[PDB]
Design a protein around this ligand. Structure first.
Ligand SMILES: NC(=O)C1=CN([C@@H]2O[C@H](COP(=O)(O)OP(=O)(O)OC[C@H]3O[C@@H](n4cnc5c(N)ncnc54)[C@H](O)[C@@H]3O)[C@@H](O)[C@H]2O)C=CC1
Ligand SMILES: NC(=O)C1=CN([C@@H]2O[C@H](COP(=O)(O)OP(=O)(O)OC[C@H]3O[C@@H](n4cnc5c(N)ncnc54)[C@H](O)[C@@H]3O)[C@@H](O)[C@H]2O)C=CC1
Ligand SMILES: Cc1ccc(CO)cc1
Ligand SMILES: Cc1ccc(CO)cc1
Ligand SMILES: [Zn+2]
Ligand SMILES: [Zn+2]
Ligand SMILES: [Zn+2]
Ligand SMILES: [Zn+2]
Lengths: 374, 374
């Protein structure tokens, strides 16, 4: 009944940095060729959405943010082949065009059609499908999931299991798949190893889950907020350390605890200092350190390259290293088969209209993931 | 006949930074338990020896430098089981104790008994075997090969093929093995890949040899000294570029030449700027960059961690990642079986007492490796 029509709906518009979202009426254009219009069912609040509000992550404003979500296809544009109206879908903040040199590489997942390197905040055709107060509103990572309806390019959506519980599997759209893959795919954590995970929010907890699945013997969670430790242990942390409790720098503490450095370290915060600390705490000859945290816009870190010359490996990754459109349906199939759990990441559930309370819960330290329901 | 006796011989002593080597009469103590005294046959001049003169590489002075060598065991201390008098041997500037967590790890080669991380310039027991007019002279990297005789710890020497030509296989003690391993073991260059090699000295030429052996399709050599290009192309470079020829940064030139970044890059100079340039020029989703060059003492580089979050891998290694005592004999056996060539690296052969002429040749840019012969 809305097919081929402009939809008027509620969305959370960010007009300026460091301001609350404005819940207001937007107009959502119908999909053009190779585009898909999705009725949102559930969206998580990721720290990367908050980085947009803070200006730590730069993307054009005004914007509809939100990138961790699940919904049901309302309609398809001409030429769409991979989803149909009524399908359950997760939007892909990292697309999979299937055509570019990265998509064709066996170990690449950062498709060259992404809007993350040089954000334009548009559809692939350089235009917006959102109007508010008669003005065009930017898209966010090709997703924009803080709206009752969104329009995505076909390369930025995956069809999932028709019986999927969308109020859980939204997390497969970002935080779970990012942390889990950071361990199983990017670091390739080995059986019997010692891991260190810096940051025990939803992504860091998912890194722990992946380290445990990979059979790590020791998983040391590190967080300045000791209220994060109990859940970190529930999902597999063998020990938790608060840097604030020690006189020595934490890389020194972790190097001692692991009898000369950890096998695998993960930076899951987004601070330059912890990126260098996490590198430093992995064993100097054969340690691996993964950057998962999104750093503050345009800022460089400083480091001593003797950290690498001894033998360390340093790497980072988007979305866990997963090829998004191949991986997300498989991840949902595994979730349905109970190969991993998402409920440990969900601490709060709120209606969409309470999005600003959801951001307050994240900022205060109280939540892991809040799931917003439409 | 000299077993158990002090040996009076000539060595090249570095008394002061930025001064010529001084040929001195030194006394070489007989080897103590688990020590081996070696008569030198040939030693290469590596840019790392020059980094001691320049103060780039800090080690206690006065010192007998030299680390890339081959010779014949003159005598063994109590308990030595791995070499006998008369054996051909290569000193190992990276030891292999076989007992530390690194030596037991399948990948690691930076044995914890090394004198590279915080140089002391001694034997394992904390003393020196060298005196000059009553004054103790420091060891360098547990090798000290700029001497007619040296004493090394048993963990810092490998027995090699009795038939091997010492005037060639001395390069297995450092520059050949470093560059070749960096490519074949550390980076794991793949068939049909595009590689970029920064620095076309003996170590960079050995990285090109390794890239070619691994079946790279394109090997781009980068050097500010265009006299290095002919020999780079002889050992497998498909193209050479001089950053001084271009009115834009070489990382942009190489990204354009490689249609959006190279598979594998190697920094084989020892400059912080080229370390970052080399990382940048590898493809942002799946590229790998290896630091080989020794950085200037205590200096940090600056870099944008978004270079790694996209998917790059950054690593470094000592001695090409080879477990020294295991690998050296097998590299020499491979040379004897014509699996690789060393003559392309050797531009000059001088007697030992002409060491300062050999360093002048390196500094002028004329030579790749000068071999000093005894
Ligand atoms: N690479 C990617 O594809 C993805 C990256 N990210 C990023 O991952 C990071 C984590 O995201 P969430 O888990 O949602 O965030 P979060 O804010 O829930 O978790 C971060 C944790 O770090 C802790 N923390 C803050 N400063 C600390 C310090 N100095 N030392 C130790 N712990 C510290 C906090 O107390 C918090 O528990 C963020 O930077 C986010 O932007 C999120 C998902 C995808
Ligand atoms: N990681 C390890 O185990 C080892 C490290 N090293 C290091 O590897 C490096 C190379 O050693 P060699 O091959 O013996 O030295 P080399 O001096 O023969 O070769 C270096 C080359 O870099 C080029 N160069 C200098 N500045 C440049 C610039 N700005 N841009 C591009 N090219 C530049 C020079 O013209 C020269 O050909 C040194 O830093 C040495 O200390 C050497 C062997 C062991
Ligand atoms: C660079 C970057 C931006 C946003 C996200 C989504 O969490 C990931 C990575
Ligand atoms: C750090 C370092 C010092 C010396 C050598 C020998 O070429 C390699 C690496
Ligand atoms: Zn693609
Ligand atoms: Zn996210
Ligand atoms: Zn060397
Ligand atoms: Zn060892």
């Amino acid at each position: 009944s809305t097919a081929g029509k402009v939809i008027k709906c509620k969305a959370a518009v960010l007009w300026e940095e460091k301001k609350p979202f404005s819940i207001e009426e937007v107009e959502v254009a119908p999909p053009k060729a190779h585009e898909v219009r999705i009725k949102m069912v559930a969206t998580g609040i990721c720290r990367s959405d908050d980085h947009v509000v803070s200006g730590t992550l730069v993307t054009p404003l005004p914007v509809i943010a939100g990138h961790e979500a699940a919904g049901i296809v309302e309609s398809i544009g001409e030429g769409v082949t991979t989803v149909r109206p009524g399908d359950k879908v997760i939007p892909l903040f990292t697309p999979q065009c299937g055509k570019c040199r990265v998509c064709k590489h066996p170990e690449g997942n950062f498709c060259l059609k992404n809007d993350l390197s040089m954000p334009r905040g548009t559809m692939q055709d350089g235009t917006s499908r959102f109007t508010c107060r008669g003005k065009p509103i930017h898209h966010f990572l090709g997703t924009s999931t803080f709206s009752q309806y969104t329009v995505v390019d076909e390369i930025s959506v995956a069809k999932i299991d028709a019986a999927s519980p969308l109020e859980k599997v939204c997390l497969i759209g970002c935080g779970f798949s990012t942390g889990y893959g950071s361990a199983v795919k990017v670091a390739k954590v080995t059986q019997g190893s010692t891991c260190a995970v810096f940051g025990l929010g939803g992504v860091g907890l998912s890194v722990i889950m992946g380290c445990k699945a990979a059979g790590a013997a020791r998983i040391i969670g590190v967080d300045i907020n000791k209220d994060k430790f109990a859940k970190a242990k529930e999902v597999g942390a063998t020990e938790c350390v608060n840097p604030q409790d020690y006189k020595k720098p934490i890389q020194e503490v972790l190097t001692e605890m692991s009898n000369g450095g950890v096998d695998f370290s993960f930076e899951v915060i987004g601070r330059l200092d912890t990126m260098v600390t996490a590198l430093s705490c992995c064993q100097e000859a054969y340690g691996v350190s993964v950057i998962v945290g999104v750093p503050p816009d345009s800022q460089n870190l400083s480091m001593n390259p003797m950290l690498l010359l001894s033998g360390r490996t340093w790497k980072g990754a988007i979305f866990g290293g997963f090829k998004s459109k191949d991986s997300v349906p498989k991840l949902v199939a595994d979730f349905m088969a109970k190969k991993f759990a998402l409920d440990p990441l969900i601490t709060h559930v709120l209606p969409f209209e309470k999005i600003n309370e959801g951001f307050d819960l994240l900022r205060s330290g109280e939540s892991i993931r809040t799931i917003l329901t439409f």
